[PDB]
Amino acid sequence: DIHRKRMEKDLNELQALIEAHFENRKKEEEELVSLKDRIERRRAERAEQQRIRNEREKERQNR
Amino acid sequence: LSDKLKEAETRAEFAERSVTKLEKSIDDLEDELYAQKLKYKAISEELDHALNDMTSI
Amino acid sequence: LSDKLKEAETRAEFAERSVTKLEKSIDDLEDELYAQKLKYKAISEELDHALNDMTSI
């Protein structure tokens, strides 16, 4: 009785554990995608900032 | 008025230099933060492969 | 000179606003990175604990 229980629990718990890790892995994948998207948009934001700095330099030269 | 104008010019020169240094520091800190995040997620992927083989046991 | 002084004061105020905004931006980025780095360090320490648990077998 005890041994059969031990195997039943070990199998079903192993399946639950694998599902839990897959859920964590997919969440990490979504965070990775968002991380790359943020890398590209930070690049765009830095481009906008340097353009704004150039505009400010022109304004400073104009006066 | 010339004294006031010169004072204003120095004040803004200081503020502008502060602007440029703060923007550079912000860019650098963002680079560091997201590089560190990438390293964290890479070791996460290593743990993913490690657990997959461990289940393969 | 009055016109020039008014223009100078307006641009100096603009630069002051800019430095203030950049200071808030850097403070926020720094806090976000502190949290992420603490997460990474916790992950590493827990991994070391796991490694000693597997070596304990």
What does this structure look like?
The structure is cut from a larger assembly and holds one copy of chain A (63 residues) and two copies of chain B (57 residues). By secondary structure, chain A is mainly α. Chain A is 95% helix and 0% strand. The longest helix of chain A is centred in the middle third of the chain and has 60 residues, at 2-61. Chain A starts with a helix and ends with a helix. Classes of the chains: A mainly alpha (63), B mainly alpha (57). Chains B, C: This is Tropomyosin alpha-1 chain. Chains B, C: The modification Phosphotyrosine is found at residue 34. Chains B, C: It is found in: Cytoplasm, Cytoskeleton. Chains B, C: It comes from Homo sapiens (Human).
The fraction of residues in strands of chain B falls at under 5%
Main pleated-sheet profile of chain A: none
Whole-Å distance between the termini of chain A? 91 Å
- Please work out how many helical segments of chain B DSSP would assign: 1
| Number of distinct beta strands of chain A | 0
Structural class of chain B: mainly alpha
* CA gyration radius of chain A, whole angstroms: 27 Å
The whole-angstrom Rg of chain B is: 25 Å
Total helices of chain A: the number is 1
Relative helix content of chain A: over 70%
Order of helices and strands of chain A: H
Outline type of chain A: rod-shaped
Give the overall silhouette of chain B.
rod-shaped
Structural class of chain A, please?
Answer: mainly alpha
Hey, which two chains have the biggest interface? Answer: B-C, 26 and 26 residues
Q: What amount of the residues of chain A lies in strands?
A: under 5%
Span of the ends, CA to CA of chain B: 83 Å
Function (chain A): Troponin T is the tropomyosin-binding subunit of troponin, the thin filament regulatory complex which confers calcium-sensitivity to striated muscle actomyosin ATPase activity.
Keywords (chain A): Acetylation, Cardiomyopathy, Disease variant, Muscle protein, Phosphoprotein
Organism (chain A): Homo sapiens
GO molecular function, one term (chain A): tropomyosin binding
